[model samples]
Target: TEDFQGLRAEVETISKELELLDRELCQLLLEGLEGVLRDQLALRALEEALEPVEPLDGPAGAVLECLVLSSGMLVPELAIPVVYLLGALTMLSETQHKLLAEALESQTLLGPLELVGSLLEQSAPWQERSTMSLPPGLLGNSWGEGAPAWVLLDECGLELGEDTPHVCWEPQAQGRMCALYASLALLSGLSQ
Candidate 1:
């Protein structure tokens, strides 16, 4: 009971600062809290924010960047908020959307290798090693040691044995993966 209360107390502190951001942004975060807020106001919020027509570059762009990075940075379950948030933000601009997609693929947290490793139940770090150790001649050709997330999700696919790439070994991981995969598919469908 005390542990639960302590965590709740921490969330309360976070809520205070989140209250200061744009309404929809707050909705997404608020939805994460258990009794405080319920329903999917965040999706509607994201819709309204992208409805008109605007490009993110200022603080707003930075926020989207953070969200995009976050989708992959976090565990599969916690990643939903950021994934949907990013899916909505894709309406912002093609260039920005492409950048976000590519950025997500680059991060080891969301990378193909790291993802598969996680599915295998191996302990892993979201932020991976930066340097690629290769023969001096081949080192220059190395770009972080693995294929981009796009290639993994789009081309190579997430298949493992008889299963599709979308499912993982973790019991609940499939749900988390479904969210990420859906977001990926939706965003991928957006035309430039």
Candidate 2:
């Protein structure tokens, strides 16, 4: 129990620091293309610079991996390397993915409705709507209209009944799925 408490505290601290770093990095990157290089270079340089200060121990490596991978606000240029690093951490099973997805969803870190709205409004011109697979509907009314039924079903899996209100059904699962779908849609746009 004590170990769990300590772990929770460490995770919270890491989350807070990562969020702050992400915001600062995003602000720096948005200043210009040069800012992009500067920010990324700074991150890399800091990683290297830390080498002499302290050896890359297990806990330090874990923190560094979390920082670089799930930093929240990622610059486009660093996306590939960051993703690669995340992927290398460990092979994630479906259960692990689901749990991680739920955690992200619960936090509202990836707002599905907002993501869909942004995609529909801003990406309509350049992105192919016909090819995109919409996320499952989170609500029965507006937000759920064109989204996939599977999304809702998955949420239902997390519950016990069919009569559950659309808005309240599988909140975490739906949000996570919606966010994933949105990310895929964005990537599709980038590919095109």
Candidate 3:
């Protein structure tokens, strides 16, 4: 009971902080073109202002929760930033990297990765609403691993495998390609 209360209190604190910066953070993540730089800035502020309660799990997990909830609610402005933020967090410290990986593995805490896969799998409708390009090299090419989330991405990739380069070259594929790289980056980062 004490443990649960402690954790809940921590979550409440995070929620309050996020609420305070809600509009500014949303704009930083949503503005076109320079969003990558803005995302970095927002992340730096978060890292500086918010210290995790346990091995970066509290902040990281809270952000993951934000990502999941935003995506479910169809709030692309918020969801996209949350995704980039999580990607950036994975590379911030070894603690964050480990925590995210553990979360990805846990059935109950796999929402972020699941979000990545869903974005790729349903890139069509997503693109119709938002045509933003994800930051390049957000997901590193090293580590070379795959998880259940990766399996979902692999399945999506295979569906497009048979398409000849030109046949798959439709500008409409932009969304899919962007989502593919986003998933690859997140998967790669967590795997590392």
Candidate 4:
């Protein structure tokens, strides 16, 4: 209180600004919260989350971020990167997730890049794609010498994940099959 009061007089402002300042700081203060299962209150998960960010596009078109800033709050610049960052958030341990949820939930964690992460988590799909048939892979195929499931997906012609099973089905199968044999054990964790 005294700190802000000092700042208030220095800036010739009123302490009533406390509500606004507190509201703003509240989100930041709310930071460092724990996860659902109560992981440790360490930034370790955050460290892991902070991996190298290799931008998908390039330095050439990167200027788009400025326009996004001037635009309405309803939108952001290069929304894709933010979406990607948000999606990346999903991969973190729950405790790390909580820390972010509290603090930036404190400020504005929404503004990010990769078009990979977005505040779009709330909005589910118009094409809520789903299927009961789990691709019986991720495990190397029973018939073949063990290979990564992604390798299998990229096989013969499922480059599109065999869009074979469907003239038009979502491509979960492709990932289960795509890529260079992924050392033949990417998610070798297999089950029928």
Name the top TM-score candidate.
Answer: 1
Worst 10 residues of 1 by lDDT: 131-140
Cα lDDT of model 4 by residue, 1-192, tens digit: 112223224222211222232332322212222221133322334233224232212211121222133332212222332233333344443433443334232222221210111101111221343232223322223323233222222331232233223212233422221111111111110100
Q: Find the candidate with the highest lDDT and give its number.
A: 3
Please list all clashing residue pairs in model 1, or write none if there are none: 158-165, 159-165
TM-scores of the models, in the given order? 0.24, 0.23, 0.23, 0.19
Stronger candidate by lDDT (1 vs 2): 2
Report lDDT (CA) for all predictions.
Answer: 0.32, 0.32, 0.35, 0.25
Q: Summarize candidate 2's per-residue lDDT along 107-177 as a digit string, tens digits.
A: 33234433444323332232232222233443334433332333433432323224433222323333333
Number of the candidate with higher TM-score, 3 or 4 = 3
| Between candidates 2 and 3, the lDDT winner | 3
CA error at residue 29 for candidate 2, angstroms? 8.5
The candidate 4 region of ten consecutive residues with least summed lDDT is 183-192
Model 2: residue 30 alpha-carbon error in angstroms: 12
**Which is better, 1 or 3, measured by TM-score?**
1
